[PDB]
Chain A
Amino acid sequence: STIEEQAKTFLDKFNHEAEDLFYQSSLASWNYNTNITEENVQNMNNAGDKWSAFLKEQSTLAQMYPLQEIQNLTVKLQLQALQQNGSSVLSEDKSKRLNTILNTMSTIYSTGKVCNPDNPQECLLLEPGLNEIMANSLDYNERLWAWESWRSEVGKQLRPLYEEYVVLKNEMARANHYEDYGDYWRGDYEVNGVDGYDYSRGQLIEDVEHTFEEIKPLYEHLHAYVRAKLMNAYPSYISPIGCLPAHLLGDMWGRFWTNLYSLTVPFGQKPNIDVTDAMVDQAWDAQRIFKEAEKFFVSVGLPNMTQGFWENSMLTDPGNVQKAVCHPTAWDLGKGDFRILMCTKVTMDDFLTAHHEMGHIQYDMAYAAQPFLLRNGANEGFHEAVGEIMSLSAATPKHLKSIGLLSPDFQEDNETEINFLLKQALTIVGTLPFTYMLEKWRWMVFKGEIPKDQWMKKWWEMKREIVGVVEPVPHDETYCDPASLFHVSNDYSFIRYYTRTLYQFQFQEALCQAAKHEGPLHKCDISNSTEAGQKLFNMLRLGKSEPWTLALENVVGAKNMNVRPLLNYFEPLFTWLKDQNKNSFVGWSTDWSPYAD
Chain B
Amino acid sequence: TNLCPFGEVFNATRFASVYAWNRKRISNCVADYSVLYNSASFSTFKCYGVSPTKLNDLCFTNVYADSFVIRGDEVRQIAPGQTGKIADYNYKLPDDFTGCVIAWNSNNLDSKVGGNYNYRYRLFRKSNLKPFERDISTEIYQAGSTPCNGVQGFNCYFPLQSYGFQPTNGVGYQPYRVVVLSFELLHAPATVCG
Contact = CB atoms under 8 A, between A and B. Distances in A.
Instruction: Kindly state the interface size class of chain B when it binds its partner.
Output: 10 to 19
Interface string A1-25: 0000110011011001101100100
B115 to A, nearest CB: 8
B143 interface: yes
A9 B143 CA distance: 7
Interface in B119-155: 123-124, 141, 143-144, 154-155
Contact of A23 (B123, B141, B166): B166
A404 interface: no
A545 B168 CA distance: 27
Interface in B129-188: 141, 143-144, 154-155, 157, 161, 164, 166, 168-173
Interface stretch (A333-341, A374-382, A563-571): A333-341
Contact of A337 (B123, B157, B161, B169): B169
Q: Shortest 10 CB-CB distances between A and B: which pairs?
A: A336-B170, A9-B143, A20-B164, A336-B173, A335-B173, A335-B169, A6-B143, A337-B170, A336-B172, A312-B168
A335 B172 CA distance: 8
Contacts of B172: 336
24 contacts: A5-B143, A6-B143, A6-B144, A9-B141, A9-B143, A9-B155, A13-B123, A13-B124, A16-B123, A19-B164, A20-B164, A61-B154, A306-B171, A308-B168, A308-B169, A308-B171, A312-B168, A335-B164, A335-B170, A336-B170, A336-B171, A336-B173, A337-B168, A337-B170
Interface of A: 5-6, 9-10, 12-13, 16-17, 19-20, 23, 27, 61, 64, 306-308, 312, 335-338
Q: Which of A5, A13, A307 has the most CB of B within 10 A?
A: A13
Interface string B19-31: 0000000000000
Nearest to A337: B170
B157 A9 contact: yes
B124 A9 contact: yes
A13 B169 contact: no
A9 B89 CA distance: 14
Nearest to B162: A20
A352 to B, nearest CB: 27
Contacts of A9: 124, 141, 143, 155, 157
Interface centre among A6, A16, A64, A335 (most CB of B within 10 A): A335
A307 B170 CA distance: 9
Interface secondary structure of B, over-half rule: loop
Contacts of B115: 20
Nearest to B121: A16
A12 B123 contact: yes
A13 B157 contact: yes
A336 B161 CA distance: 19
B193 to A, nearest CB: 41
Nearest to A339: B168
A312 B171 CA distance: 12
A306 B170 contact: yes
Contacts of B164: 19-20, 23, 335
Nearest to A19: B164
Given A9-B157, A17-B161, 11 more contacts: A9-B141, A10-B143, A13-B123, A20-B115, A20-B164, A23-B164, A27-B168, A308-B170, A336-B171, A336-B173, A337-B168
Tell me whether chain A's interface is mostly helix, strand or loop, or mixed.
Answer: helix
A446 to B, nearest CB: 36
Contact of B161 (A10, A16, A23, A335): A16
Interface string B97-134: 00000000000000000010000000110000000000
Contacts of B124: 9, 12-13
Contacts of A6: 143-144, 155
Interface centre among B161, B166, B170, B172 (most CB of A within 10 A): B170
A308 B168 CA distance: 7
Contacts of A16: 123, 161
A20 B143 CA distance: 23
A312 B164 CA distance: 18
B107 to A, nearest CB: 9
Contacts of B173: 335-337
A5, A10, A308 — most chain B CB neighbours (10 Å) = A308
A336 B74 CA distance: 14
Nearest to A312: B168
B124 to A, nearest CB: 7
Nearest to B158: A13
Contacts of A337: 168-170, 173
A9 B159 CA distance: 11
A335 B157 CA distance: 23
A64 B170 contact: no
B91 to A, nearest CB: 18
Nearest to A15: B123
A19 B161 CA distance: 12
Nearest to A369: B73
A12 B154 CA distance: 14
A420 B166 CA distance: 47
A338 B171 CA distance: 11
Contacts of A61: 154
A336 B157 contact: no
A19 B143 CA distance: 22
A335 B154 CA distance: 28
A312 B115 CA distance: 16
B22 to A, nearest CB: 23
Chain B CB within 10 A, most for which of A9, A17, A338: A9
A430 B20 CA distance: 63
Interface in B69-85: none
A307 B144 contact: no
A120 to B, nearest CB: 50
A64 B171 contact: no
A291 B166 CA distance: 26
A27 B166 CA distance: 11
Nearest to A8: B143
Contacts of B123: 12-13, 16
A406 to B, nearest CB: 36
A64 B154 contact: yes
Contacts of A20: 115, 164
Contacts of A19: 164
Contacts of A338: 170
A337 B143 CA distance: 32
Nearest to A17: B161
A533 B144 CA distance: 45
B123 to A, nearest CB: 6
Contacts of A335: 164, 166, 169-170, 173
A349 B137 CA distance: 59
A307 B105 CA distance: 14
Nearest to A333: B168
Contact of A336 (B141, B143, B169): B169
A337 B168 CA distance: 7
Nearest to A2: B144
Contacts of B168: 27, 308, 312, 337
